[PDB]
């Protein structure tokens, strides 16, 4: 609807800001470094085994991408209010939820085009310069990785919108965004694991594998590691649930469901924002 107009202005902001260059340049540096400069932790300097890169790169992405999305989106709502342009925009015939979805689609297209551009330099970087990779497996693996990364970007965007609608000032918005970032990666894993190890020696064995759905950062990791990838041996945390949360579309539906509930939460909070 008029949603496309707001998404268009957000994309225009993306070009007029070093963001689109910065997100794509650094994300491509991530991707290329893991393939050639990466694997040097073992001393074997350069190789591009597709199963490795899409897993180490996957973990570095599950850390980087939520933070990038939060930095992009935390000031979408609070930033406009502080700027003084939010009150003007509501005067236009635009629904509060309509502008919220417009901002969401704008930032989401920013990060999606960004990841596509960044790996597009990467995808050629492997294919042309590597020696004898089966291009088909590379293509479908990085395809799942691109779509998973952009979907995680969208879900953390939605989290940024909900926290921004809750907050009153830019700095407090950044603080809550940092808290939400730290919570999922470092705490939803640690507390949950600790939960099995001591709270659950025999307290309730059956529940722990499924709860990993709540955290999108875990869902993302399981989606990108398990895959059709061969030699699929999962270490701690993932191995519980690597074997069977019964999926192959269930995780994708759950991630989309998180984005959905978060967008509804943002629409609800932003509707009651003023006064």
């Amino acid at each position: 609807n008029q949603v496309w107009n707001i998404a268009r202005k957000e994309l225009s902001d993306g070009l007029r800001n070093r963001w689109l260059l910065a997100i794509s340049l650094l994300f491509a540096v991530l991707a290329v470094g893991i393939a050639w400069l990466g694997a040097a932790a073992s001393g074997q300097l350069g190789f591009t085994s597709i199963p490795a890169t899409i897993a180490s790169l996957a973990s570095l992405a599950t850390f980087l991408m939520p933070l990038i999305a939060l930095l992009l989106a935390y000031d979408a709502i609070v930033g406009e209010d502080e700027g003084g342009t939010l009150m003007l925009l509501l005067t236009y015939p635009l629904g509060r939820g309509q502008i919220l979805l417009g901002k969401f689609v704008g930032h989401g297209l920013i990060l999606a085009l960004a990841v596509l551009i960044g790996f597009g330099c990467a995808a050629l970087a492997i294919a042309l310069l590597v020696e004898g990779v089966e291009l088909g497996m590379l293509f479908w693996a990085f395809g799942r990785f691109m779509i998973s990364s952009t979907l995680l970007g969208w879900v953390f965007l939605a989290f940024a919108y909900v926290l921004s609608g809750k907050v009153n000032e830019k700095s407090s918005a950044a603080g809550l965004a940092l808290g939400v970032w730290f919570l999922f990666v470092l705490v939803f894993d640690l507390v949950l694991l600790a939960l099995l190890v001591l709270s659950e020696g025999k307290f309730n064995p059956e529940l722990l594998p499924w709860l990993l759905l709540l955290n999108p950062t875990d869902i993302y990791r399981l989606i990108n590691l398990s895959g059709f990838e061969g030699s699929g041996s999962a270490m701690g945390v993932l191995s519980l649930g690597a074997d069977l949360p019964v999926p192959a579309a269930v995780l994708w539906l759950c991630l989309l469901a998180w984005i959905g509930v978060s967008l509804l939460l943002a629409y609800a909070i932003f509707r009651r924002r003023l006064t």
């Binding site: 107009n5 225009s12 003084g84 003007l88 005067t91 015939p93 635009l94 003023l274």
Partner: protein, 298 residues
């Protein structure tokens, strides 16, 4: 039948800001809101927009509820401290705003020329000055087909030429049948271009009506600056005993205050005794009306 307000009372936290503010406007009438700095001019406009929902009052905006975006389709609003995105081009900013409002791309450049900003267009809003940003806001207001146009303190920043050009624009838009709610603090120069006026102090609405009825009920006396009419004290003692206030400045000048209501015949005698060096007669001005009504509230 443009805005119909049914005794709205608005509360901000525990502080009431408006109480039983019942106001109305015609479809083609122009109503000048005036009041104290902390009364409620902007908040009332914000209620009209539909930014806030009145706790006690059902406002009708363009014969419809203000929540509906169909009202905002043909309604334009110019905000005070109109701040814009500071890294968008003025032409680009106004084109984006038109894209939001649906107006044709042919209108944008012609309207930028009309306001008087096309010469400095294509440069980012940050470079603009307090004036050009005000002119960009005014361009935003006139964007599209505005049936109802809400201006907030709108002459802030503009030139006297720009102010009078905007005044002629408002008069023309009244001729075209559009509805204007103009609030301003420069009372000089708005008496001619404003049909109906309203004065509100604190929350209660002090009065409302066109200039004629508002002037008549007050019966505000006329002020006459003079300097050397006939002598230093010739004209003073003929009015001090006549029950009229007249303070005589030491520099051979007498300032008499007439009523201008019924003694219009006495105006012939006022300037007919001796040849005067300098006379400056100021009729009861709507700014003096504002001062009078503020002295009524308090």
């Amino acid at each position: 039948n443009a805005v119909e307000i049914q005794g709205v009372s608005q509360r901000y936290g525990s502080m009431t800001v408006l109480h039983d503010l019942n106001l109305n406007l015609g479809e083609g009438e122009v109503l000048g809101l005036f009041g104290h700095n902390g009364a409620g001019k902007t908040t009332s406009m914000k209620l009209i927009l539909g930014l806030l929902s009145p706790s006690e009052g059902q406002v009708k905006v363009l014969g419809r509820a203000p929540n509906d975006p169909q009202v905002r389709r043909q309604l334009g609003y110019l905000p005070e401290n109109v701040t814009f995105y500071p890294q968008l081009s003025g032409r680009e900013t106004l084109r984006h705003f038109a894209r939001l409002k649906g107006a044709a791309l042919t209108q944008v450049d012609e309207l930028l020329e009309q306001v008087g900003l096309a010469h400095a267009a294509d440069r980012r809003v940050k470079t603009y000055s307090k004036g050009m940003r005000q002119r960009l806001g005014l361009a935003q207001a006139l964007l599209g087909e505005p049936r109802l146009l809400l201006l907030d303190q709108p002459t802030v920043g503009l030139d006297p030429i720009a102010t009078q050009d905007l005044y002629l624009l408002i008069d023309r838009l009244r001729q075209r049948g559009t509805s204007i709610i103009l609030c301003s603090h420069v009372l000089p120069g708005v008496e001619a271009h404003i049909n109906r006026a309203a004065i509100l102090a604190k929350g209660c609405l002090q009065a409302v009506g066109s200039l004629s009825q508002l002037r008549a009920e007050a019966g505000l006396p006329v002020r006459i600056r003079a300097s050397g009419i006939s002598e230093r004290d010739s004209w003073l003692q003929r009015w001090t005993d006549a029950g009229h206030s007249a303070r005589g400045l030491s520099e051979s000048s007498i300032e008499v205050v007439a009523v201008n209501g019924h003694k219009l015949v006495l105006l012939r005698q006022l300037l007919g005794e001796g040849e005067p060096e300098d006379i400056e007669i100021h009729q009861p001005s709507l700014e003096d009306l504002y001062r009078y009504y503020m002295e009524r509230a308090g």
